[PDB]
């Protein structure tokens, strides 16, 4: 993560999106399994998908960009969309 300044993150349910505080860049949760699970077979094998994106969010590494920012700034949330 130190090699990059910006990050585009797709949340599949690993973190709460009903927070007043920002969602974590890196979390301990796990994606949520959707009700409408489905599969495709046109490639000769089953490709089954069980998840969908819940939110889309951007983070910027602010110390790499600025320099005077508190060390816990790699995962700094800038903006996000809620996909309900």
């Amino acid at each position: 993560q130190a090699d990059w300044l910006f990050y585009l993150v797709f949340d599949y349910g690993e973190r709460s999106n009903n927070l007043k505080t920002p969602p974590a860049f890196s979390t301990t949760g796990s994606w949520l399994c959707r009700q409408d699970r489905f599969s495709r077979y046109e490639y000769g094998f089953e490709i089954r998908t069980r998840r969908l994106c819940r939110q889309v969010l951007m983070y910027h590494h602010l110390q790499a960009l600025d320099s005077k920012i508190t060390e816990h700034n790699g995962p700094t949330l800038v903006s996000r969309l809620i996909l309900n």
Binding site: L5, N18, H60, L62, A64, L65, D66, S67, I69, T76, V78, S79, N84
Partner: protein, 1225 residues
């Protein structure tokens, strides 16, 4: 159905990567006139007759040649990197169009119109100079990064160099072009036998390296300018500290969450700061910096804490002493109703989660619109929710700005609060500014407008209100008004409240507006055909609506007739002076060149003369370079002007219409390239003088302390020197000085030593000071002697009162109070002499339709003027219902002044009341009648005769009561449109002899000649010519760099009046020194408040020679009529000192005063200008001549219209005004 215009674009050839190597743009000619015209019902007979022109029937073939680099191999693929292009045009007639038109096979054929290798006009070529970050020498091929060093383009070839005519020798031209930065070279796509062309190089970049990411390090707009630089931030993604060639450096800090600069520092080290909210929207700004090395503003946030509210109501109610400006509140969600605590308590407290899970209630309590409607459709709706939503008083998405102008210790001026509402399409619905207490429209809680008004302290000026069609076009607009709220008013009630004023916009299927319907009671309308556009004004459409009977304007539209390149070639006007006659169809003709630029233009009068006498030239003739710059212009009325510019586009060498040679010295390419000086000479002079010189500031501490870095601080011109002492943080002059040249000195600012310039300069030097608020509004002003003004503003930032103290004196109130309409027009003004003016408006147009001035202590009406108008806006009548005035004998009521116009809105006639003894209008202003004279005033009428060229030729004046019957006869050249009175000549063949090469009139009357300077301002006028050793009575002037008059010097040479009347013009101060050649007779300092033509109040202060019947520190209040002409001048107690009526063309119709001593101090008269003793009144850039109505000289300003030498306001002096001369075009 027929005769469309048609164009076709044909790719002739392309490479394997699809790039257009060869391409032709085909413009087809106009189709042969058919038997049937499908639209004549609404046309004049001559619109069909004059619909066809040669310029509409040519086949125009514009051909492109091109090439691109392609870096293609196994490891790199970079395509489409252009390095060359050429454009040429072939022309053929209508007869050369192949049957069936043009297409690619016809064109690719060997013998086609462009395949046949015949000559064509070269329009230009361009080249790309590629680099590698090391060399300035262009690469044969580009790098992977396509780094471009610069762009080359053609500017000149022999057809454009010939355009310089005789203004420069060919030896000098070749030298000059290289000095000017042009390179003579070959063609990218040459043909056999072609000559070399000149190019300009621009857009220079020095690039960094891969390690720095491939970013620029240094750049220059052109080869001749200084390079500028910047610092890349640590990650080469952000620009830091841009820096000028002069060492002027800016600085900034970014909010890295948004990569958006938030802290900005200028070259004078002043600072601006904003912050951003969570979404990246700017929220409120702060500023600080120094003005005289001393810090001022709000400073940084830690010095004066402030937290922007999220609440619009709190914002509306915030206190004046905020340490911020432009405070923002955003409410984009206001359209979406929100759950209240009460409905929560009655329902959601137990069921919140059901509605939340049902996606009706949002995280913040807002109510979903689409999900809610679905909830209802599904029949799951709940009555507490239904009521909550139905009763939600939602407003369009909006925001509020709290505009402040306060700083430091001063919170005194109230915050300007503006709420703006947008629609759901991102368009602007309206905005309103909190205004002052007064009447306003009322509203109901459902946003329902009530037209009736009531007084309130809480009202906002609602403006720009617009309703849209959801494409973004207005379909309806509303007039401005005051509302006793800021909240948006429902569009439904606005439509219902018929008494409210609004306009309707009617569009065709394209979206072009074709009918405009106004509240005024009439409408505009237009017709489009492939060849012309017909603009029907209100007076024409008024014929259906059925004041001069609109039959006069029936079918008299203004019509634009186009060529087949989309340029306007004919301007067709229909001139009728009677509704029962035929129009004189007037067509202004225009010819475009091969580049589509105007080639030449001529009016109908000279056009027809030209047809029988071909030695008569156009009003305009033009020449252009290959980029379209106007290298040369020539006019039969105004002479020939030629200019050669630099690469940036600024002049280097120019020759005026009068032959004056001027040249400009700029800083070198290692420097910023700013102007340093201008030198000039007439053809007869061999050594030029430096008439302009600029001493530029750098980046030093002293310059920064006074905010002068990068500014020109010493400006030497034709009058003297202007010097900046200090600028404000708002960019205004905080302090400046000025010193003028001694009468006998010339502007020749040579050498490098200020001592010399100081010896050239007079010892009369002054400094003025100004105090500003944080937005730059003027709060106070100290003049050259020490007289001090103080201003007050309303919440909207408009002047709402004014005070003045003379040096050493107690402050006087000049304006007790001032207030405005929703449209910002003066509504009421209360003067310090206990005189009150009320302003009567027409809501339909928000036009001033009347002026009422009273002296409330005896409720005396001093004036009451009403203005009546036609459908377009020509005043057709003015009537003053007030008592005629104390200077009149046995007369109480003045007659209505009527005005008659023709179909072109020319003033044909006017009537009114004039002094019985006014006599002949001339250059000599009459004595006033005094009240003891028992003066008789009489009725008059005056008729204005215009020719076919739009020139005034005769003024027929009559007054049967005194038989003041005479005609002013204007003789106009029969070759040009130059004109003089019969006084100088009756012969149209000799009129031209009364003008110089540049169109400046040579003489006023026999014995009174006009001595013009090199720029066009009049240098000197002879008033009394004497012979042999006698000295002539003369008036001479000194003007500044912008033509502003600095001095008016009237020198009387008579042995019993050897006297100099010296008037110096200083901002807001007139220094009027009258002295005999041996002794001062009078010395008067006039300090003014406000502007002439805007009811300016003046105070007369004497240091010497005050008359026995004159008070010192005397206040003089000018009351102007609708056009700025001074109607009355009142004293400090509101009594009438004097009055004047004017003829429409600036003459004097009526003139009287209480005391001729007092009358002698009134100089501001017609349309706010002074009546110069010469009879030729100076307006910026030119002088007004009342017996002609066409001033004295021309201007380069006329272009596209095809206008003559000059005329006053398109001949409608009682409706249209142009005090600055900005109208011609």
């Amino acid at each position: 159905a027929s005769d469309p215009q048609c164009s076709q674009n044909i790719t002739l050839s392309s490479d394997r990567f699809g790039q257009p190597l060869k391409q032709l743009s085909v413009q087809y000619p106009r189709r042969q006139q058919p038997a049937i015209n499908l639209y004549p019902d609404t046309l004049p007979d001559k619109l069909l007759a004059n619909s066809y022109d040669d310029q509409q029937r040519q086949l125009r073939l514009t051909y492109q040649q091109s090439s691109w680099h392609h870096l293609t191999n196994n490891t790199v693929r970079v395509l489409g990197l252009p390095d060359s292009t050429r454009s040429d045009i072939f022309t053929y007639g209508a007869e050369n169009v192949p049957a069936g038109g043009l297409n690619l096979e016809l064109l690719s054929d060997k013998n086609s119109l462009i395949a046949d290798d015949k000559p064509r006009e070269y329009l230009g070529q361009q080249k790309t100079a590629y680099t590698d970050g090391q060399n300035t020498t262009p690469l044969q091929t580009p790098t992977r990064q396509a780094l471009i060093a610069f762009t080359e383009t053609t500017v000149f070839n022999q057809s454009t160099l010939s355009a310089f005519n005789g203004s420069i020798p060919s030896d000098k031209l070749s030298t000059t072009l290289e000095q000017a930065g042009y390179q003579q070279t070959n063609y990218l796509f040459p043909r056999t036998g072609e000559d070399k062309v000149w190019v300009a190089h621009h857009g220079y970049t020095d690039y960094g390296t891969a390690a720095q990411f491939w970013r620029p390090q240094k750049q220059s707009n052109t080869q001749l300018t200084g390079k500028i630089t910047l610092i890349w931030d640590a990650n080469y993604c952000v620009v830091v500290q841009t820096r000028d060639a002069a060492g002027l450096t800016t600085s900034a800090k970014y909010d890295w969450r948004f990569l958006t600069p938030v802290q900005l520092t200028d070259i004078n080290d002043n600072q601006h700061l904003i912050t951003l909210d969570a979404l990246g929207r700017p929220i409120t700004l702060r500023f600080w910096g120094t003005e005289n090395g001393k810090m001022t503003g709000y400073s940084s946030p830690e010095k004066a804490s402030f937290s922007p509210p999220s609440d619009v109501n709190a914002a509306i109610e915030l206190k004046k002493p905020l340490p911020v400006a432009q405070c923002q509140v955003y409410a984009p969600e206001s359209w979406m109703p929100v759950l209240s605590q009460k409905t929560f308590n009655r329902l959601a407290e137990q069921d919140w989660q059901k509605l939340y899970n049902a996606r009706i209630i949002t995280e913040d309590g807002r109510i979903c619109t689409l999900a809610y409607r679905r909830w209802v459709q599904s029949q799951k709706a709940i009555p507490q929710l239904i009521s909550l939503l139905n009763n939600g008083p939602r407003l369009p998405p909006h925001s509020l700005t709290l505009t402040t102008d306060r700083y430091d210790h001063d919170p005194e001026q109230q915050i300007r609060q503006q709420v703006v509402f947008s629609d759901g399409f991102g368009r602007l619905l309206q905005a309103a500014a909190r205004h002052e207490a007064g009447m306003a429209r009322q509203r109901n809680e459902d946003g329902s407008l009530i037209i009736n008004v009531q007084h309130t302290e809480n009202r906002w000026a609602v403006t720009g209100r617009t309703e849209y069609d959801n494409k973004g076009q207005p379909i309806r607009t509303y007039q401005p008004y005051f509302l006793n709220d800021w909240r948006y008013v429902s569009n439904d009630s606005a439509r219902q409240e018929k008494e409210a004023y609004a306009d309707t916009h009617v569009y065709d299927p394209i979206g072009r507006e074709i009918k405009v319907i106004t509240a005024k009671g009439w409408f505009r309308r237009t017709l489009f055909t492939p060849w012309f556009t017909v603009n029907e004004d209100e007076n024409d459409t008024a014929a259906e609506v059925k004041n001069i009977d609109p039959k006069l304007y029936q079918k008299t539209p203004t019509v634009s007739v186009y060529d087949n390149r989309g340029l306007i070639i004919r301007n067709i006007d229909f001139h009728r002076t009677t509704a029962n006659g035929d129009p004189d169809t007037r067509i202004t003709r225009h010819q475009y060149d091969i580049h589509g630029h105007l080639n030449q233009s001529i009016d109908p009068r000279l056009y027809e003369a030209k047809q029988t006498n071909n030695t008569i030239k156009p009003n305009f003739l033009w020449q252009y370079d290959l980029t379209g710059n106007p290298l040369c212009t020539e006019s039969i009325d105004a002479g020939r002007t030629v200019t050669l510019n630099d690469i940036e586009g600024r002049p280097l060498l120019t020759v005026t219409a009068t032959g004056v040679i001027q040249t400009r010295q700029y800083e070198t390419s290692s420097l910023p390239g700013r102007l340093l000086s201008v030198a000039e000479q007439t053809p007869e002079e061999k050594t030029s003088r430096i008439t302009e010189r600029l001493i530029w500031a750098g980046n030093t501490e002293a310059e920064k302390d006074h905010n002068l870095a990068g500014q020109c601080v010493r400006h030497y011109d034709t009058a003297g020197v202007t010097r900046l002492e200090s600028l404000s943080l708002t960019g205004t002059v905080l302090s400046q000085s000025s010193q003028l040249l001694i009468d006998t000195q010339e502007a020749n600012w040579t050498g490098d030593n200020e001592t010399v310039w100081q010896n050239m300069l007079a010892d009369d030097i002054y400094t003025t000071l100004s105090t500003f608020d944080a937005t730059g509004a003027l709060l106070t002003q100290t003049d050259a002697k020490g007289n001090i003004q103080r201003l007050a503003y309303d919440v909207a930032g408009q002047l709402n009162g004014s005070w003045l103290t003379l040096k050493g004196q107690t402050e006087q109130v000049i304006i007790k109070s001032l207030t405005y309409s929703a449209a910002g027009q003066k509504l009421r003004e209360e003067h310090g002499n206990d005189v009150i003016t009320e302003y009567s408006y027409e809501p339909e147009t928000q036009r001033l339709i009347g002026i009422k001035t009273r002296r409330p202590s005896d409720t005396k009406v001093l004036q009451d003027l009403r203005y009546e108008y036609d459908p377009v806006g020509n005043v057709i009548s003015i009537r003053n219902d007030a008592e005629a005035t104390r200077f009149w004998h046995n007369q109480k009521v003045m007659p209505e002044n009527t005005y008659t116009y023709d179909s072109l809105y020319q003033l044909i006639s006017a009537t009114g009341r004039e002094m019985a003894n006014i006599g002949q209008q001339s250059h000599q202003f009459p004595s006033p009648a005094l009240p003891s004279d028992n003066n008789t005033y009489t009725n008059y009428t005056r008729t204005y005769t215009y020719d076919r060229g739009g020139n005034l030729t005769k003024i027929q004046h009559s007054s049967p009561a005194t038989q003041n019957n005479y005609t002013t006869n204007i003789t106009v050249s029969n070759r040009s449109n130059r004109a003089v009175l019969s006084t100088l000549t009756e012969d149209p063949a000799q009129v031209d002899a009364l003008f110089d090469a540049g169109g400046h009139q040579n003489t006023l009357i026999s014995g009174q000649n006009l001595n013009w300077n090199t720029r066009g301002e009049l240098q000197q006028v002879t008033l009394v010519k004497r012979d042999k050793g006698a000295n002539d009575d003369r008036e001479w002037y000194r003007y500044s760099g912008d033509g502003r008059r600095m001095l008016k010097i009237n020198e009387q040479q008579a042995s019993n009046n050897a006297q100099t009347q010296r008037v110096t013009y200083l901002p807001n101060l007139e220094l009027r020194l009258t002295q005999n050649s041996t002794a001062t007779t009078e010395d008067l300092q006039v300090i003014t408040v406000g502007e002439a033509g805007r009811a300016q109040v003046r105070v007369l202060h004497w240091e010497s020679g005050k008359p026995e019947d004159i008070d010192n520190n005397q206040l003089r209040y000018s009351y102007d009529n609708l056009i700025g002409s001074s109607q009355l001048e009142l004293d400090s107690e509101g009594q009438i000192i004097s009055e004047e009526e004017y003829y429409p063309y600036g003459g004097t119709a009526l003139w009287a005063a209480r005391n001729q001593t007092e009358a002698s101090y009134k100089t501001i008269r017609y349309s706010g200008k002074e009546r110069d003793a010469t009879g030729l009144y100076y307006y910026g850039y030119r002088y007004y001549q009342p017996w002609i109505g066409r001033w004295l000289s021309s201007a380069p300003a006329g272009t596209i219209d095809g206008l003559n030498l000059y005329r006053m306001v398109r001949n409608n002096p009682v409706t249209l005004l142009d005090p600055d001369g900005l109208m011609p075009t």
